[PDB]
Write a protein that binds this DNA or RNA. Structure first.
Lengths: 226, 111
DNA sequence: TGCATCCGTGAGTAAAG
DNA sequence: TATAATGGGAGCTGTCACGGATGCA
């Protein structure tokens, strides 16, 4: 494989003669493709947290849970989701959608969730007082593709509802492997806190899994078709 | 074909870890490390080549190699793991020699 | 069934050297 | 025993005729 380009096929996957293996490789035979020295190891770390959001009762689409991409509400007019605590803003933008976290001294006091359709009006580290707009929701709004809503708890108060979502999603972190380092973990295996992913010559260059996640191999040095 | 730095490092690494695994298998089984190495080698190369080794105290024929391979295959999972380690190390040894055979020629041509 | 073509093999005795 | 080193050089020639095995059409 030329430098930097990725594999159009996956490790362990059976292939056919003539089927292209990559943007510049076509396999001359059929069988089990195999990866030789993946250069970038991406770990999809899992996260099960709890986050809130307040919406008008008219715009809401009541459900017990929300699959990714599924519509959460539809708004006739722009709506301003306002802060219900006072703190400093920890903005954590996912692929699409974001998380707001407020903390007062240092401990978090609010964890909000802004699904797709809500443009955050705050910068990481900003100070917010109670009741000021954290985001504008314009029109329809839906869950992101990367995050799913396991359970939903609602509360009616006035002409609004407040959703305490039991969210579950994954965040990627890449790791660069060097020719003196070897991947001791298969494709799609589960690691915990402390498990080793890529060994090396000296312990200070090893790759240890911080939290639990799913392992993914990209950019192999070469692909072996057997 | 000539190795890439990665393939070279990988083969050398497997060789070192296979030698370590033979050491561990001698620790466990209480057998002789050289006899263990000869058995692993015999199985990796095939029955095509099996002969009496001068240092070994026993004559190396397919009967005794089958006996020792069975005493090895009757190990617990975390013990029998070292057997696969040693086998892969021997295969890496063979491929490393074969990969670097050209250097010998390019040196010997000057003698 | 017949030819061209190739490979191997042998090419004097005694003397001195 | 530790930079890295990764596929070779020399042919060498004025017969000759036969016999027998191989190769084509």
């Amino acid at each position: 494989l030329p430098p930097g380009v990725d594999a159009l096929v996956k490790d362990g996957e059976e292939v056919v003669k003539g089927q292209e293996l990559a943007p510049g490789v076509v396999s001359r035979l059929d069988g089990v493709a195999l990866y030789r020295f993946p250069r970038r190891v991406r770990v999809e770390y899992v996260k099960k947290e709890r986050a809130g959001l307040r919406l008008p009762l008219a715009a809401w689409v009541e459900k017990e849970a929300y699959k990714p991409g599924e519509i959460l509400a539809e708004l006739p007019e722009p709506y301003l989701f306002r802060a219900e605590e006072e703190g400093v803003v920890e903005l954590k933008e996912l692929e699409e959608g974001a998380f707001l976290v407020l903390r007062r001294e240092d401990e978090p006091v609010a964890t909000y969730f802004l699904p797709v359709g809500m443009t955050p009006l705050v910068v990481h580290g900003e100070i917010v007082e109670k009741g000021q707009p954290l985001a504008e929701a314009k029109g329809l709004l839906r869950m992101p593709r990367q995050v799913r809503a396991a359970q939903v708890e609602a509360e009616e108060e006035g002409e609004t509802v407040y959703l305490t979502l039991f969210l579950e999603w994954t965040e990627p972190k890449d790791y660069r492997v060097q020719p003196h380092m070897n991947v001791v973990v298969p494709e799609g295996a589960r690691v915990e806190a402390g498990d080793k992913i890529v060994a090396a010559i000296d312990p200070e260059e090893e790759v240890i899994a911080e939290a639990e996640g799913v392992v993914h191999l990209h950019e192999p040095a070469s692909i072996l078709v057997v | 074909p000539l190795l890439t730095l990665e393939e070279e490092v990988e083969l050398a690494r497997k060789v070192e870890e296979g030698m370590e695994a033979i050491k561990k298998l001698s620790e466990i089984t209480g057998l002789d490390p050289d006899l263990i190495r000869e058995v692993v080698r015999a199985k990796i190369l095939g029955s095509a080549r099996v002969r009496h080794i001068p240092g070994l105290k026993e004559t190396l024929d397919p009967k005794t190699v089958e006996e020792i391979d069975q005493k090895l295959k009757s190990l617990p999972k975390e013990h029998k793991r070292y057997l696969h380690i040693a086998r892969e190390g021997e295969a890496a040894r063979q491929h490393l020699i074969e990969a670097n055979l050209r250097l010998v020629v390019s040196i010997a041509k000057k003698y």
